[PDB]
Design an enzyme around this catalytic site. Structure first.
Site, short mmCIF file in Angstrom:
data_model
loop_
_atom_site.label_atom_id
_atom_site.label_comp_id
_atom_site.label_asym_id
_atom_site.label_seq_id
_atom_site.Cartn_x
_atom_site.Cartn_y
_atom_site.Cartn_z
CE1 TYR B 90 -3.73 10.31 5.44
CE2 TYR B 90 -3.98 7.75 5.20
CZ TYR B 90 -4.05 8.93 4.42
OH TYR B 90 -4.02 9.19 3.45
CG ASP B 149 -1.41 -2.43 -3.17
OD1 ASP B 149 -0.95 -3.29 -2.64
OD2 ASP B 149 -0.62 -2.08 -4.11
CE1 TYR B 467 -8.58 11.83 -0.28
CE2 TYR B 467 -10.37 10.66 0.81
CZ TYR B 467 -9.21 10.68 -0.31
OH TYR B 467 -8.48 9.49 -0.54
NE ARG B 468 -7.49 7.85 5.55
CZ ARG B 468 -7.27 6.71 5.11
NH1 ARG B 468 -7.18 6.25 3.81
NH2 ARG B 468 -7.12 5.56 6.00
C1 LIG Z 1 1.90 2.21 1.89
C2 LIG Z 1 0.44 2.85 2.03
C3 LIG Z 1 -0.30 2.39 1.34
C4 LIG Z 1 -1.82 2.77 1.54
N1 LIG Z 1 -2.84 2.57 0.65
C5 LIG Z 1 -3.75 2.90 0.95
C6 LIG Z 1 -4.99 2.84 -0.06
O1 LIG Z 1 -4.87 2.05 -1.08
N2 LIG Z 1 -6.35 3.12 0.31
C7 LIG Z 1 -6.59 3.59 1.36
O2 LIG Z 1 -7.76 3.85 1.69
N3 LIG Z 1 -5.75 3.89 2.36
C8 LIG Z 1 -4.47 3.35 2.04
N4 LIG Z 1 -3.25 3.66 3.07
C9 LIG Z 1 -3.56 4.33 4.46
C10 LIG Z 1 -4.01 3.07 5.47
O3 LIG Z 1 -2.92 2.46 5.55
C11 LIG Z 1 -5.27 2.36 5.23
O4 LIG Z 1 -6.35 3.30 4.98
C12 LIG Z 1 -5.77 1.45 6.16
O5 LIG Z 1 -6.73 0.56 5.86
C13 LIG Z 1 -6.08 2.31 7.51
O6 LIG Z 1 -6.09 1.59 8.75
P1 LIG Z 1 -7.29 0.85 9.65
O7 LIG Z 1 -7.97 0.18 8.38
O8 LIG Z 1 -6.80 -0.04 10.68
O9 LIG Z 1 -8.12 2.05 10.23
P2 LIG Z 1 -7.88 2.29 11.91
O10 LIG Z 1 -6.53 3.09 12.32
O11 LIG Z 1 -8.49 1.44 12.54
O12 LIG Z 1 -8.93 3.68 11.97
C14 LIG Z 1 -8.57 4.93 11.16
C15 LIG Z 1 -9.39 5.92 12.04
O13 LIG Z 1 -10.73 5.97 12.02
C16 LIG Z 1 -11.44 6.47 13.30
N5 LIG Z 1 -11.90 5.07 13.78
C17 LIG Z 1 -11.35 3.91 13.42
N6 LIG Z 1 -12.23 2.90 13.80
C18 LIG Z 1 -13.21 3.45 14.69
C19 LIG Z 1 -14.40 3.05 15.18
N7 LIG Z 1 -14.57 2.00 15.38
N8 LIG Z 1 -15.15 4.07 15.68
C20 LIG Z 1 -14.87 5.34 15.73
N9 LIG Z 1 -13.75 5.84 14.96
C21 LIG Z 1 -13.00 4.88 14.44
C22 LIG Z 1 -9.99 6.82 14.12
O14 LIG Z 1 -10.15 8.32 13.88
C23 LIG Z 1 -8.92 6.21 13.71
O15 LIG Z 1 -7.74 6.90 13.84
C24 LIG Z 1 -1.99 3.33 2.73
C25 LIG Z 1 -0.94 3.73 3.25
C26 LIG Z 1 0.24 3.42 3.41
C27 LIG Z 1 1.21 3.47 4.32
#
Ligand SMILES: Cc1cc2nc3c(=O)[nH]c(=O)nc-3n(C[C@H](O)[C@H](O)[C@H](O)COP(=O)(O)OP(=O)(O)OC[C@H]3O[C@@H](n4cnc5c(N)ncnc54)[C@H](O)[C@@H]3O)c2cc1C
Ligand SMILES: Cc1cc2nc3c(=O)[nH]c(=O)nc-3n(C[C@H](O)[C@H](O)[C@H](O)COP(=O)(O)OP(=O)(O)OC[C@H]3O[C@@H](n4cnc5c(N)ncnc54)[C@H](O)[C@@H]3O)c2cc1C
Lengths: 518, 518
Positions: B90, B149, B467-468
């Site tokens: 993303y 995951d 949606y994302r």
């Molecule tokens: C191989 C692979 C598998 C994945 N599998 C999954 C899965 O099973 N399920 C899933 O849901 N996702 C999945 N993802 C997507 C992603 O890796 C995960 O969702 C991950 O947990 C998101 O990163 P994060 O929790 O650090 O969010 P962050 O990068 O910390 O936040 C995401 C975004 O939310 C906003 N944001 C974050 N924190 C705040 C805050 N405190 N206040 C305001 N805005 C904020 C910003 O827009 C930011 O860019 C996957 C990705 C890959 C590469």
């Protein structure tokens, strides 16, 4: 008897009402004598200038709603939207601010879709629980709805006010999905997947993309909702409603302790409701049938009512849903949780020896059947209005018994019978106080009002805040949420001024006023 | 290599960075060479001036966040908040608009509370799934979490972006309850019961009183979240994960038909995930172990992979939760739904003859255990980045097969292997396309980008919206939701300008820009 709203000339109000009749037709603007059903049925105020609607307009369509709002902006005339206006105990159809014009959307009563395979409905604000139920039964669709009791009201209006019912689908606004809204500037928007043309997913997925905004139109004056989706439960493979009674007033402490794990883990599939003796007795009896004194009932009368009716001092209604092996397993867990309490009794419908009976009535509600009853708490003392106070607290014995003690003491000292319940949604306990009073008598109205103020004050000092309230108390409850010098309401006011700069939508709803009236 | 953001002088950016170091300490402002981990790891753009962070600040506390925001307003310098910045696929930690300063909140990593009796946690944005899991195991608390995951990421950041996992608690933002937010003007607010001083209910009841606003801070640039509550599932009385495989690519039509009622009624308790052969094979194998050709795998190779791995063309993972009599009853219903499909097979863990195996891996995830694996889809073709497209559709066979056909055709024509899954949340189907590519190679990057644009365009014309999405596509996806000349984004922009008039929070998040940049 109703005054013009402050700031609005008689010329302005006259032009507006005129343009309203050009929009909806002259037959759909009400004034003068036809305004009386828009009055609060359960008067609290002794000042007859308070909460008085000036007029009502009843549009036929979304686009009419839009024209009205545009005209409201043009002449500075405030509107109070209602879906069906059955918010009894909360002010009925009446506005916070006298002189507000009611925007009655009862005529917009189309059931736009009921979808059996995906378990949802898309409804306009005029649709009642009775009409939705009747539609589903008529088409033979294998769906249940979730209803308040008594079961009057709008599917839309009740959900927007964070209303509740008695099935697994009991959190009405949580089951909402997709809405159409007329904004305070008269523009029309659809939320979620509805903002994508050609979707077939408006009622299948809440979020859409971007900020999730449906919630801001609940308990709000940020827009007028004209269509709303709601999820409907598929008819389950079985249904077994039950009543567990407890003999002593003190039992509610240990009962709440045992309820906590069952509810957190979802072993109890619907809301748990534990009602005091009187509240359940009033379903099939009145006070004067057991006691002729003016004041609250004494203990000897309580014991008589319990023996006649097979009720306890506390009465827990819940229900089991799904295949019999599932219901059997869940029941084992529930029953074992309470078996060791002295004086406990357990009933399914076939165990109720009365044919007109609390469990039989509540069994209907916990299956999503909308009903009116001949007797309920409103007739306990031969008539009157009611108000409720339902603050949130943790699911602990300590919190339950403390609220019971605090509230029952004051309610009885004021001369009212105690009618209370402990309700659990999922993780949230509510000690709900119901107070029936003579709304025709100004001395009673004064007592009720004072009692209400004190109950709120004392509850809030223990950390218990209200989530839904009458029009008269909306400012009071807003001031409960006062952290960091009212920072949350300051944000709500920022949003109000941007979406509604002329402040023409429901001034004062949820204690939100707008720049021209703050 | 990173440009100043448009409108911001070098003098302005220098004063700001200075005042930032006065607020957080000089050691917690990063520039120049230390910015590289804030770059998107899976580059798409061939223009190296795009999505480039100018600088990063890493505050220690909410109140520091507030000071930073106030300074941002003072000098016109835009901020991009991240919790842990693990949004791989993303855009990682990178902003939409080059020159934006990253507001890295990784240092705010306190687990403020984990409550076993009420099943919740209150966490700061820096808290990872690994850390939350480790805390719970360490204290021996009988709670499960819900994880993506692979299991990297912030509990907060993932939830705010509408992320998902594989237990009954798989809708992360739906499980959120209470937040603290720093608004774009630098004021601090708490939502729900948190706005009441002395509550013990912030994480027990979502709404509080009045407009429900938590949602507006998800997928949003309306504020910075500094604390967030989330509900946690009590450890269930049993747990039985399963895999159902299907032999033919065409089976996905009838499989989706049969999944619909089980999911609507909740007979399947977690999200249903039906993954294509390659996606599941890539957990324990790479391409070059079965085929040396440059292009997508042929059918004879597919049949070889199926026989080696005991996988089908489609692979349905789900799990049973609760007491064994409940699991037994639900299983009967699930298994009977698919028994008559030719070539179907059913596995529990003990039926898997491989010790390193898809079901064994997914069993961990569907129990809320965060893991990294040695092999997943990223290594299928010997390395690269990924992007995903996960639009919403109705749960029908027709919709599933149409998307499979549309997407697999184009993906394969571009030279990529098809990796797709059909995911069902509750009422919502998502055909999720995963595309692994060589992010170092500019010719591949161009192909990927073009393919992505076309898949979105063609999906949207069939009524399937995303949606994302990745930072690069946020404007594109916003334009999907275009009903009534973009009326919903017009409302979002109204709210943006009121809450953030200087437009200093994450310009362009979710396609929301603000008056100075529209
Ligand atoms: C191989 C692979 C598998 C994945 N599998 C999954 C899965 O099973 N399920 C899933 O849901 N996702 C999945 N993802 C997507 C992603 O890796 C995960 O969702 C991950 O947990 C998101 O990163 P994060 O929790 O650090 O969010 P962050 O990068 O910390 O936040 C995401 C975004 O939310 C906003 N944001 C974050 N924190 C705040 C805050 N405190 N206040 C305001 N805005 C904020 C910003 O827009 C930011 O860019 C996957 C990705 C890959 C590469
Ligand atoms: C004896 C008794 C028992 C009750 N039992 C229950 C119960 O079990 N559960 C329960 O939840 N309630 C209960 N109530 C309260 C109430 O009667 C019901 O909640 C009822 O369904 C609400 O009326 P309504 O549906 O017409 O809402 P309305 O009056 O139509 O709407 C309520 C409010 O929401 C807003 N609003 C409504 N429609 C819109 C719209 N389209 N756009 C914008 N804002 C809008 C306004 O602020 C309006 O005042 C009970 C009341 C009594 C007297």
């Amino acid at each position: 008897a109703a005054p013009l709203p402050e700031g609005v000339s008689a010329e302005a109000m006259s032009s507006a009402l005129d343009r309203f009749a050009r929009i909806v037709g002259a037959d759909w603007v009400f004034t003068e004598d036809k305004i009386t059903p828009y009055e609060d049925p359960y008067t609290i105020s002794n000042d007859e200038t308070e909460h008085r609607p000036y007029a009502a307009v009843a549009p036929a369509s979304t686009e009419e709603v839009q024209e009205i709002v545009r005209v409201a902006n043009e002449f500075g005339v405030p509107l109070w939207p209602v879906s069906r206006g059955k918010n009894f105990a909360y002010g009925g159809a009446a506005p916070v601010m006298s002189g507000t014009v009611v925007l009655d959307m009862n005529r917009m009563n189309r059931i736009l879709e009921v979808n059996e395979e995906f378990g949802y409905a898309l409804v306009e604000p005029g649709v009642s629980y009775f009409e939705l139920y009747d539609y589903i039964q008529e088409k033979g669709l294998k769906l249940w709805i979730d209803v308040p009791d008594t079961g009057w009201g709008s599917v839309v209006g009740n959900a927007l006010d964070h209303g509740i019912g008695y099935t697994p689908y009991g959190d009405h606004f949580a089951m909402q999905c997709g809405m159409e809204v007329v904004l305070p500037n008269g523009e029309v928007v659809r939320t979620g997947m509805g903002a994508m043309p050609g979707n077939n997913t408006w009622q299948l997925f809440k979020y859409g993309y971007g900020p999730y905004v449906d919630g801001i139109f609940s308990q709000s004056n940020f827009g007028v909702v004209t269509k709303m989706g709601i999820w409907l439960m598929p008819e389950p493979a079985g249904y077994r409603p039950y009543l567990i009674t407890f003999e002593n007033e003190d039992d509610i402490e240990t009962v709440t302790e045992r309820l906590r794990p069952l509810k957190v883990a979802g072993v109890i599939q619907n809301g748990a409701t534990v009602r005091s003796l009187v509240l359940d007795a009033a379903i099939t009896r009145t006070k004067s049938q057991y006691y002729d004194g003016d004041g609250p009932i004494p203990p000897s009368v309580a014991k008589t009512m319990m023996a006649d009716l097979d009720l306890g001092m506390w009465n827990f209604c819940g229900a089991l849903y799904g295949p019999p092996p599932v219901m059997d397993t869940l029941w084992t867990a529930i029953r074992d949780s309470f078996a060791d309490i002295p004086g406990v009794k357990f009933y399914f419908p076939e165990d109720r020896r009365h044919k007109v009976d609390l469990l039989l009535h509540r069994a209907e509600t916990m299956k999503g059947v909308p009903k009116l009853t001949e007797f309920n708490f409103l007739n306990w003392d031969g008539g009157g209005g009611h108000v409720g106070f339902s603050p949130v607290s943790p699911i602990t014995g300590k919190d339950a018994i403390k609220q019971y003690n605090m509230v029952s003491s004051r309610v009885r000292e004021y001369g009212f019978d105690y009618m209370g319940l402990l309700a659990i949604g999922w993780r949230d306990l509510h000690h709900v106080t119901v107070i029936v009073y003579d709304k025709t008598d100004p001395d009673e109205r004064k007592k009720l009002d004072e009692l209400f103020n004190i109950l709120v004050d004392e509850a809030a000092a223990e950390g218990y805040g209200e989530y839904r309230t009458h029009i008269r108390y909306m400012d009071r409850i807003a001031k409960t949420y006062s952290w960091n010098d009212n920072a949350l309401w300051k944000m709500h006011e920022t949003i109000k001024d941007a979406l509604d700069p002329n402040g023409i939508l429901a001034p004062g709803k949820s204690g939100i006023w707008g720049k021209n009236r703050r």
